[PDB]
């Protein structure tokens, strides 16, 4: 069972630095080429760094050369990426990925296993907690309610309904960035027999500001 598990992502200002780690298990780490690949917000995939079996050779595209340093400790079965002089366009999800077996006799330059990724945001925008607003109708056997999670930074937030008890009938929409702040909404549809006769509450969390809000949806 191959496992790659990244850590270290976070929010950093323009020109800042971050150090990413990837813990490898399930295989002979020291026998494989390893790489870092990133998924951009527009879902492009970009190689950012590769390293051979020992720490001897490394490769960087010109876009990060001189800014990023990839290393590895084969004792600790650990891959590292030191990211410096960071730029807005380094914002991405960073995957740790395994390349060729050292003695393959035929290198493919393919990534046969990828970690789940660690998330990096490079921006100078100010971290801001969300305002959480209840969405109730003005005035069907079902009723749709909502929460508007507005004016926060950075991503992500999480939204649940009735502490996770309402799972079906929920749509949490991807946040939209405008002028250095994100807005996100979430809808929940429930039987009209359950609201307003019973309580419907959206539970919003924004780790990056340590904010957690429980907003009941009050009729009228």
């Amino acid at each position: 069972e191959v496992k790659l598990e990244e850590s270290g992502g976070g929010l950093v200002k323009l020109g800042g630095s971050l150090k990413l780690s990837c813990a490898a298990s399930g295989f002979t780490f020291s026998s494989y080429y390893m790489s870092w690949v990133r998924q951009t917000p527009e879902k492009r995939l970009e190689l950012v760094a590769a390293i051979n079996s020992n720490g001897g050779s490394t490769y960087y595209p010109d876009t990060v050369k001189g800014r990023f340093t990839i290393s590895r400790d084969n004792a600790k079965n650990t891959l590292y990426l030191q990211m410096s002089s960071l730029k807005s366009e380094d914002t991405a999800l960073y995957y740790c990925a395994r390349g060729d077996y050292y003695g393959s006799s035929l290198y493919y330059y393919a990534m046969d296993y990828w970690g789940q990724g660690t998330s990096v945001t490079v921006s100078s925008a100010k971290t801001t907690p969300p305002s959480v607003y209840p969405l109730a109708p003005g005035s069907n056997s079902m009723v749709t309610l909502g929460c508007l999670v507005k004016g926060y930074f950075p991503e992500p937030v999480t939204v649940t309904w009735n502490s996770g008890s309402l799972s079906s009938g929920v749509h949490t929409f991807p946040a939209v960035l405008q002028s250095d702040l994100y807005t996100l909404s979430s809808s929940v549809t429930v039987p009209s027999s359950t609201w307003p006769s019973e309580t419907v509450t959206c539970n919003v969390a924004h780790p990056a500001s340590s904010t957690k809000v429980d907003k009941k949806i009050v009729p009228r």
């Binding site: 305002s131 607003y133 969405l135 109730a136 749709t144 508007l148």
Partner: peptide, 16 residues
């Protein structure tokens, strides 16, 4: 489904 601004948001000077 269409939703008016909350009283919470109006209180702060905005309306979505």
């Amino acid at each position: 489904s269409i939703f008016p601004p909350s009283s919470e948001q109006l209180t702060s000077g905005g309306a979505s």
